[PDB]
Amino acid sequence: RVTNQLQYLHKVVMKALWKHQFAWPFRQPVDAVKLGLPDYHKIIKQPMDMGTIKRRLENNYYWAASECMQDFNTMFTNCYIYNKPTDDIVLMAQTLEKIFLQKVASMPQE
Amino acid sequence: GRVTNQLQYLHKVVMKALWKHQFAWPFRQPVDAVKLGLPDYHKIIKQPMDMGTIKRRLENNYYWAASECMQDFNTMFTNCYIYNKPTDDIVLMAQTLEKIFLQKVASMPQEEQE
Ligand SMILES: CCNC(=O)c1cc2c(-c3cc(C(C)(C)O)ccc3Oc3c(C)cc(F)cc3C)cn(C)c(=O)c2[nH]1
Ligand SMILES: CCNC(=O)c1cc2c(-c3cc(C(C)(C)O)ccc3Oc3c(C)cc(F)cc3C)cn(C)c(=O)c2[nH]1
């Protein structure tokens, strides 16, 4: 499905987030083996990353805007829940999530 | 602060839907860390936020733009995810409310007026 809302999420929201200096830890799934995090997939049951969201927008996976917005939300929430409050990654996620919300405030109404 | 079409939608549509939700009660007022016996709360959460504060701010025309009110809702949810354990029920309550917040925000009027 291709709606004006999903087009905006792809061309405005994803475009702004993908290129952000803090985006690199979120562009691909968390490689728990490489990172040495054996409890990752035990705590995070729904892993999500921008690369998966990007691939989904490119292959018209979503039916509604709300579904893509929930995937961005899952990615940020996974980060806050798994990591320690003082981890830099939490600050990086918060910075990107603020941009996500600022952009979503201007999204088409459908 | 001013009265925009988007700020009106956040008050009459978004806040209206969230305030009355069965899972809203722990979010209607600030986290009472003294009553809860949580001495580390204000050490980890430096920007406390709750729906009651957001509601009072919408009622008193505190915000200049919808994006500012949306950031306060986001701070409230993020504070919950960061402070609590992954398995705490409060995290599930916050996630349920945040999904409604995002569903409602998707239907907000696109352009901000006055
Ligand atoms: C409880 C401890 N948690 C972690 O260690 C942890 C690490 C990570 C990473 C992450 C992913 C990658 C690649 C590109 C391989 O994907 C690379 C580095 C990453 O993190 C670091 C960052 C951002 C800066 C550093 F100086 C060092 C590291 C390790 C992503 N996400 C979303 C996480 O939630 C997460 N948690
Ligand atoms: C790591 C430990 N974390 C907590 O203890 C914790 C408690 C809380 C509360 C919260 C606030 C209040 C009042 C009105 C007094 O403020 C009352 C109960 C609350 O929680 C409970 C709920 C929802 C159901 C229960 F069966 C029991 C409790 C305690 C709110 N928020 C947003 C939190 O993030 C939070 N974390």
From A4's Cα to the closest Cα of chain B, the distance in A is: 12
φ/ψ (deg, to 5) at B52: -65, -45
A46–B contact, CB cutoff 8 A: no
The last residues before gaps in chain B (C-N over 2.5 Å) are none
Q: Give the count of domains, chain B.
A: 1
Q: Could you give the CA distance from residue B50 to residue A13 in angstroms, rounded to a whole number?
A: 27
Cα distances (angstroms) measured from residue A5 to each of A18, A30, A110: 18, 28, 6
Cβ proximity of A82 and A40 under 8 Å:
yes
- Specify whether the CB–CB gap between B74 and A98 falls below 8 A: yes
Nearest-angstrom CA–CA distance, B112 and B114: 7
Question: Cβ contacts of residue A24 below 8 Å, gap of 6+?
Answer: none
**Resolution in angstrom units:** 2.0
Q: What is the CATH number of the domain that holds B75?
A: 1.20.920.10
Q: Which two tokens mark A79?
A: 């980060």
Confirm if A103 and B101 have CB atoms less than 8 A apart. Answer: no
The minimum-distance atom of ligand 1 relative to the CA of A83 is 1
Which range of residues forms the domain containing residue B39?
1-114
Residue A61, marked binder: no
User: Given CB atoms, is B50 within the 8 Å cutoff of chain A?
Assistant: no
Q: Does B95 sit in the ligand 2 pocket, CB within 6 Å?
A: no
